[PDB]
Each structure stands twice: as C-alpha cells, then as structure tokens.
C-alpha cells in the first residue's frame, strides 16, 4: 500500500510533515510483535540449565550474586508483597534487560561487516529481544513513574552494565549469552511469584486499566487484567531464556557462524 517512491526519494527533507503526524502507540516498535495464547503460556514454568564448565559457572554465580544483593538492598525480602514494590522492581531491572541484545546484535553486525560474512539470522533475533525488553520498560513506566534518586541510579547502572556487557561479549560471547540465560531464569521465577500472589489473593491488583502500549503490542482485548499483562511479559522471558541458552551452547560447540535455529519458527 505505502506511497513511498521516487518523488519522495528526491525530496531534500520531510521536516515539514513532522507537526502533522499522529502519535499512535503501535509506532513505538516494529511489527515483529509476539503472539501469545493466554491459556497456553499460563503453564510456562521454572527451569534451570546446568552449568557446564568454568565460564558457565562464573556466569551463574554472578547472577546469583546480583539477585542476592539486589533482593536485600532493595528490601524486596521482608514486608508483604505489594503492587508498589513489584512494579518499582520490574521498572528498574527492565532498564538493564534491554542492553544485552543491543551489544550482541551490534557486535555481530560489526563482525558481519568486517570479515564480510553472512550472519544467518542472529542479529535480528537479539535486536527484537532488546526492543521487546524496552517495551517492558515502556509498559511499567505507564504504571509507575519514578522519582529523582531511582532515575539517577538507573543512569549509573547503564554506565556500568553497558561497559560490562560490551567488554564481556568481546572476550566471551558465550559468557554473556550464558549470563542472560540465567538472568531470565530469575526473571521467570519473580514473575510466576507475582501471578501466584494474585491467584492466592495476597496481591489483589489495582492497575487493571492495562496501558494502550501493552494492549497493541501483545494484542490484548480490553478486558485484560494485570495478571494477564504479567503472564505475557513472563512468557517473553522464557523465550529469551532458551534463546540465550541455545546461543551460549552453540558457541560452546563452535557453531557461532552457523544458522540461528529460531529462524524456522516464523
């Protein structure tokens, strides 16, 4: 349908149309949207993949280290589950789930460029993850808008984590792929906790006006609840879990330069 041709291709700029373009939410992201069936992802579950050698273990310990610090300094531990402390948590952490896929895709892109080789579907998987995790941030920022101290520490988190993920991927892309493997193993846990808590009425949700950003992106009918929004986010994490564990494995076997297995499901 699109009216994008050579009369538009010879224009100097479209700076002038800018004031008259709607801000329809579906533009926030590409159309590689995930399609989940609520009754099917409902039975998503908690898995754990056994570390194989030193690097796998190094990876696994730092995630157990990070979970333990974060869970204790952020007081998630004692007190009853709350809406406030769930979304505040998911808000902060989602800012750092967006970085990995962008360092991998970006570096694998540069490699594809300098040795002039075919990537075989890897780049477009990691960048849709990154995107899909950024949409996880976008949704929670419709739910809780943070204040100055939480914002400043988000900025320093990215400084540090961008530097770590970047230099960790260059030296061991299996490490970073293992690391998100396990990262997501924890993200699956936390979320099924939130659903279990709703189901056992310990956290009866007040944010049921599910944001338009999330309705379009996950194609949810108006009558969707917070629990239905959470499950889909949790379903996305189970995928990344397998994707980064498959990716790490593939490296272990020296299949870096082989077809991205998840191309078939499309």
Q: How far, in Å, CA of 235 to CA of 164, rounded? A: 27
Asked if 174 touches Fe ion (CB under 5 A), the answer is: no
Does residue 148 touch its own copies according to CB under 8 A?
no
CB 211 within 8 A of CB 142: yes
Question: How many other CB atoms are there within 10 angstroms of residue 247's CB atom?
Answer: 27
Q: What is the DSSP letter of 14?
A: -
Whole-angstrom distance, CA of residue 16 vs CA of residue 2:
19
Find the binding residues for Fe ion in span 177-206 (CB under 5 A).
187
Q: Which one, 124 or 172, has the nearer CB to its own copies? A: 124
Interaction between residue 234 and ligand [O-] (CB under 6 A): no
Residue 194 is a binding residue for ligand [O-] (CB under 6 A):
no
Instruction: Give the Cα separation of 108 and 106 in Å (integer).
Output: 6
Asked if 97 touches ligand [O-] (CB under 6 A), the answer is yes
Residue 240 among known ligand-binding residues: yes
Query: Counting contacts by CB under 8 A, is residue 118 touching its own copies?
Result: yes
Annotated ligand binding at 31? The verdict is no
133 is in an annotated binding site: yes
- 212 annotated to bind ligand: no
CA dihedral sign, ordered 248, 169, 109, 216:
positive
Told to check if 242 binds its own copies by CB under 8 A, we report: yes
Region of residue 220 (phi > 0: left; psi between -120 and 50: alpha; otherwise: beta): beta
Q: 46, 190 in Cβ contact below 8 A?
A: no
> CB 110 → ligand [O-]: shortest distance, Å?
16
The answer to whether the annotation marks 42 as part of a ligand binding site is no
Could you say whether residue 258 binds its own copies (CB under 8 A)? yes
* 96 is an interface residue for ligand CHW by CB under 6 A: yes
Q: Which residues are annotated as a binding site for Fe cation?
A: 94, 133, 136, 184, 237, 240
């Amino acid at each position: 349908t699109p009216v994008w041709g050579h009369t538009q291709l010879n224009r100097l700029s479209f700076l002038e149309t800018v004031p008259v373009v709607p801000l329809r939410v579906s533009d926030e992201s590409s159309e590689d949207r995930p399609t989940w069936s609520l009754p099917d992802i409902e039975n998503v579950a908690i898995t754990h993949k056994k570390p194989n050698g030193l690097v796998d273990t190094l990876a696994y310990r730092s995630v157990r280290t990070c979970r333990w610090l974060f869970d204790t300094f952020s007081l998630y531990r004692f007190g009853s589950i709350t809406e406030s402390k769930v979304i505040s948590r998911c808000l902060f952490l989602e800012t750092v789930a967006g970085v990995p896929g962008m360092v991998g895709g970006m570096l694998r892109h540069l490699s594809s460029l300098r040795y002039m080789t075919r990537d075989k579907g890897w780049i477009n998987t990691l960048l849709v993850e990154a995107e899909n995790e950024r949409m996880h941030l976008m949704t929670f920022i419709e739910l809780r808008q943070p204040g100055l101290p939480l914002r400043v520490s988000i900025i320093i988190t990215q400084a540090i984590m961008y530097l770590f993920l970047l230099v960790a991927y260059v030296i061991s892309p299996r490490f970073v792929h293992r690391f998100v493997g396990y990262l997501e193993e924890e993200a699956v846990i936390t979320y099924t906790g939130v659903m279990r808590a709703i189901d056992e009425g310990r956290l009866r949700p007040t944010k049921n006006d599910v944001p338009e950003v999330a309705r379009v992106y996950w194609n949810l009918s108006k009558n969707a609840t917070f629990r239905d929004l959470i499950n889909v986010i949790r379903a996305d994490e189970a995928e990344h879990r397998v994707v980064n564990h498959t990716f790490a494995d593939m490296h272990e076997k020296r299949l870096q330069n082989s077809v991205n297995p998840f191309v078939v499901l499309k």
